[PDB]
Amino acid sequence: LNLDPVQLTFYAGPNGSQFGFSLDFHKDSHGRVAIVVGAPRTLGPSQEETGGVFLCPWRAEGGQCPSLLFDLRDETRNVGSQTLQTFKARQGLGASVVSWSDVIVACAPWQHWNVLEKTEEAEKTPVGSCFLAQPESGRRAEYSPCRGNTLSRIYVENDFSWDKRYCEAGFSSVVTQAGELVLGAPGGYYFLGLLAQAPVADIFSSYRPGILLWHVSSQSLSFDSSNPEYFDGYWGYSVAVGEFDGDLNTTEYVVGAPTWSWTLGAVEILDSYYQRLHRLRGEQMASYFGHSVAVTDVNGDGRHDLLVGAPLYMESRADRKLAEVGRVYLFLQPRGPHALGAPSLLLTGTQLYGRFGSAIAPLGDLDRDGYNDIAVAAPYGGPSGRGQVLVFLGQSEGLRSRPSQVLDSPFPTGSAFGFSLRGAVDIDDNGYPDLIVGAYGANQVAVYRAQPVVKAS
């Protein structure tokens, strides 16, 4: 119980804003720590849901936070014979947030977009968008790699090839250590899913206020497929990064496609040019294998290991009866150029409809025993069904089969305690990594501090 469950800090956002739907740690420039929090149904001055982002500084007491201002008005712009339009109603700004260096990236997956030319159009569709902010300088930029100006008719004659109109870019997001932003777009290419990547430096430098449609020169998008296995696979529902080919110069991507091959689900590991290295198939259909993906070295051998979440996995029980509890899979990375194999360990939920594996967070080395640890969210788990987060400690063999600590939700029913999870950062500067937990249903975020031993309370 070395994560103090009594001395909790609570931050809160507006009612109905889904404050805590996403979150991340932010180190300004570059010492003090703050929490960026997404609230994707925050109202704008107009009383329509545009979403918002909050930047909470560290305070033991917690409370309300300042809003990170973004452009919330719709844009209309005529270029040549075309009219380009953005629609921010219900766009879900703060559906995903991620901090890198002195920059915060916040995305609106359901921002709509349209282009008009004479009597024709591209169709009004959710291409999505991400907003980048440099909070100290006040600088702003945008990145919306799925916006196009091809008219409806052309896609019909193409049989809908290279159709990025429903991307929902920024559904998921991650930044590499080098500063490459990687966006998941599950609706890409007519719901196959795609990834879009660009250097944060180049997004800022190539952005021009009032353009709406532009090409970031160093950007890189994944590919369309005619392979039925990928159809409606939601490739990019979740995303992560790591080292998986033993070459520290290159960086690999981990992508979740939780409805791949007729809802079997799959996680793929690719290089930065989207050429796939390994594929992990789902165990059971409709389990949403790949809903979440985490990367960390849990067994201390210096090689990143893979954690995949299957929240809707149904477990076998007496009298041939299945029970939806959720499951998490651990894949240890072997030495040499060898590929990953079968799961080294299967962690399974206990509570019915609990959705164990819905979120997976690296905690770093929580008890400083030389092995990194993880936290797994069961947003509707625990005896009451109010939510639960389980801490699993790492070891030489992989991870422990049973949790060292179980954090029960302090919020009422429907809070979604655990839906978002982040750790591996020392927030109060006591030398020990802490954990933050979102409860978007209650519009709150809980901060759990690590105590300076393997303590209890």
Ligand X SMILES: *[C@@H]1O[C@H](CO)[C@@H](O[C@@H]2O[C@H](CO)[C@@H](O[C@@H]3O[C@H](CO[C@H]4O[C@H](CO)[C@@H](O)[C@H](O)[C@@H]4O)[C@@H](O)[C@H](O[C@H]4O[C@H](CO)[C@@H](O)[C@H](O)[C@@H]4O)[C@@H]3O)[C@H](O)[C@H]2NC(C)=O)[C@H](O)[C@H]1NC(C)=O
Annotated binding-site residues read 243, 245, 247, 250, 252, 297, 299, 301, 303, 305, 365, 367, 369, 371, 373, 426, 428, 430, 432, 434
Determine if 365 is a binding residue for Ca ion (CB under 5 A): yes
CA distances from 70 to 44, 53, 138 (A): 10, 8, 10
> Which of the choices ligand NAG, other proteins, Ca ion, none does residue 314 contact, using the CB cut-off of 5 to 8 A by kind?
other proteins
Annotated binding site for Ca(2+): 243, 245, 247, 250, 252, 297, 299, 301, 303, 305, 365, 367, 369, 371, 373, 426, 428, 430, 432, 434
- Residue 367 binding target from other proteins, Ca ion, ligand X, none, CB below 5 to 8 Å by type: Ca ion
Of these, 274, 278, 353, 451, which contacts other proteins (CB under 8 A)?
Answer: 353
Are the CB atoms for 255 and 196 separated by under 8 Å? no
The whole-angstrom separation of Cα 37 and Cα 443 is 10
Coil vs helix vs strand at 442:
helix
User: What, of ligand NAG, Ca ion, ligand X, none, does residue 73 touch, CB below 5 to 8 Å by kind?
Assistant: none
Site string for ligand X, 339-378 (x = CB under 6 A): ----------------------------------------
The tokens describing 251, both together, are: 């960086």
Chain residue at closest Cβ approach to ligand NAG? 15
Which residue shows structure tokens 């987060």? Answer: 389
- Residues between 222 and 281 with contacts to Ca ion, criterion CB under 5 A: 245, 247, 250
* Binding at 187: pick from Ca ion, ligand NAG, other proteins, none (beta carbon under 5-8 Å per type): other proteins
Residue choice 262, 273, 384, 402 for contact with ligand X (CB under 6 A): 262
- Tokens for 95, please give them: 């559906």
Could you tell me which of 365, 241, 371, 350 has the C-alpha nearest to residue 306? 241
CB of 97 within 8 A of CB of 37? yes
Q: Kindly report the CA angle at 76 between 224 and 145, in degrees rounded to 5?
A: 25
- The interface mask with other proteins, positions 168-187, x = CB under 8 A, is x--x--------------xx
Site for ligand X in 271-310 (CB under 6 A): 281
- Residue 162 within binding range of other proteins, rule CB under 8 A: no
Binder of other proteins out of 121, 224, 408, 428 (CB under 8 A): 121
Question: Least distance from C-beta 114 to other proteins, angstroms?
Answer: 6
The reply on whether position 320 binds other proteins by CB under 8 A is yes
Min separation Cβ 259 and ligand NAG, Å: 32
- Phi and psi (nearest 5°) for 127? -75, -25
Query: Hey, what are 443's tokens?
Result: 């519009």
228 part of the interface to ligand X, by CB under 6 A:
no
Tokens coding 207: 């952005």
- Using CB under 6 A, count the residues that bind ligand NAG: 2
User: Whole-angstrom Cα distance, residue 133 to residue 141?
Assistant: 7
Q: Residue 262's binding partner, choosing from ligand X, Ca ion, ligand NAG, none, with beta-carbon cut-off 5 to 8 A by kind?
A: ligand X
Q: Is 15 in the site for ligand NAG (CB under 6 A)?
A: yes
Residue 453 has a CB neighbour count (10 Å cut-off) of 10
Q: 338-347: long-range contacts (C-beta < 8 A, 24 or more apart)?
A: 339/277, 339/278, 340/269, 340/278, 340/280, 340/306, 344/398, 345/398, 345/399, 345/401, 347/376, 347/392, 347/399, 347/401
What residues contact 366, with CB distance under 8 A and at least 6 apart?
2, 3, 373, 391, 393, 432, 433, 450
CA distance 298 to 395: 7
**Residue 152 binds which one of other proteins, Ca ion, ligand NAG, none, with CB within 5 to 8 A depending on kind?**
other proteins
* 3-class SS letters over 42-89: CECCCCCECEEEEEEECCCCEECCCEECCCCCCEEEEECCEEEEEECC
Q: Which residue is nearest to ligand X (CB)?
A: 262
DSSP secondary structure letters along 256-312? EETTHHHHT-EEEEE-TT--EEEEEEPSSTTS-TTSEEEEE--SSSSS-EEEEEETT
Number of residues engaging ligand X in binding (CB under 6 A): 2
119 binds ligand NAG (CB under 6 A): no
The length of the chain in residues reads 457
- Beta pairing partners, 327: 310, 348
- Which residues contribute to the site for other proteins (CB under 8 A)? 90, 92, 109-110, 112, 114, 121, 123-126, 152, 166, 168, 171, 186-187, 190-191, 231-232, 234, 258-259, 262-263, 284-286, 288, 291, 311-312, 314, 320-324, 352-353, 380, 416, 440
- Which residues contribute to the site for ligand X (CB under 6 A)? 262, 281
- Which residues contribute to the site for Ca ion (CB under 5 A)? 245, 247, 250, 297, 299, 301, 303, 305, 365, 367, 369, 371, 373, 426, 428, 430, 432, 434
- Which residues contribute to the site for ligand NAG (CB under 6 A)? 15-16
